[PDB]
């Protein structure tokens with residue numbers, strides 16, 4: 201049932217490439233008539249034991265999760281020669297929130313942007329109740345089912361919190377909280393930070409010039425060296441350097457962003473909290 205047969209998975213197109221993963225659109229079509237279900241398939245870009253072990257854990261993790269705003273696990277598919285291992289998932293027809301927002305911005309108002317925001321908060325809340333830290337939260341990882349539902353769509357860098365400890369110690373630096381940057385410590389709090397950045401991406405409607413890597417580079421200066429970029433970002437963050445209130449953004453909204461971007465871990469709000477505020481802010485909007 202959870203087992204998918206490699207010969208019946210017809211390739212259709214590529215959808216994209218993540219950290220070490222690759223994503224394909226496939227039809228699972230045993231009857232050979234093309235009536236089978238279109239599904240999304242993630243596999244190791246280039247397989248090795250460590251990545252496989254990691255990937256199997258990613259799989260156990262997604263298997264772990266039932267939620268409205270988390271993409272649906274379907275099953276797995278073992279390749280002959282055990283060369284690939286594939287994660288089978290429900291196909292969401294609009295791609296990532298990044299690209300969806302990128303080109304249907306005309307019909308996306310602040311109101312919708314908050315429906316999207318609460319949904320993401322709830323997913324993370326639930327993620328949170330399972331003691332899982334996403335670590336890689338961003339519009340490019342959030343997927344659009346239809347205009348009224350988005351789901352967290354990748355968990356390729358998701359980790360389990362050790363039984364006692366409240367953080368994990370071990371990519372995309374402009375979404376990272378500072379203690380993740382300096383101490384490599386990830387937690388529910390570092391996810392709230394990144395979520396602040398997602399909130400930002402949202403109300404920038406993904407102008408390419410207004411992306412976080414761009415805006416921060418506009419600070420770090422595009423003249424700096426290599427590793428020198430992190431180091432300057434840190435310093436900048438240490439002294440409360442922050443992304444700007446995007447054009448047209450309500451300070452009520454921006455205020456959450458900066459609340460999430462708190463140098464002090466514990467002062468950062470909870471997803472529980474965040475979801476409620478957003479929802480209330482939403483209700484108010486009446487026009």
Ligand SMILES: Cn1cc(-c2ccc3c(c2)[nH]c2c(C(N)=O)cnc(NC4CCCCC4)c23)cn1
Nearest residue numbers: 215216217218240289290291292293294295354
């Ligand atoms: C032409 N056409 C393409 C799309 C469009 C293209 C992109 C994606 C797509 C539909 N549906 C998904 C699925 C899903 N579970 O079905 C999972 N992740 C994807 N992208 C990942 C790439 C790596 C980074 C993480 C996200 C895609 C819509 N129309």
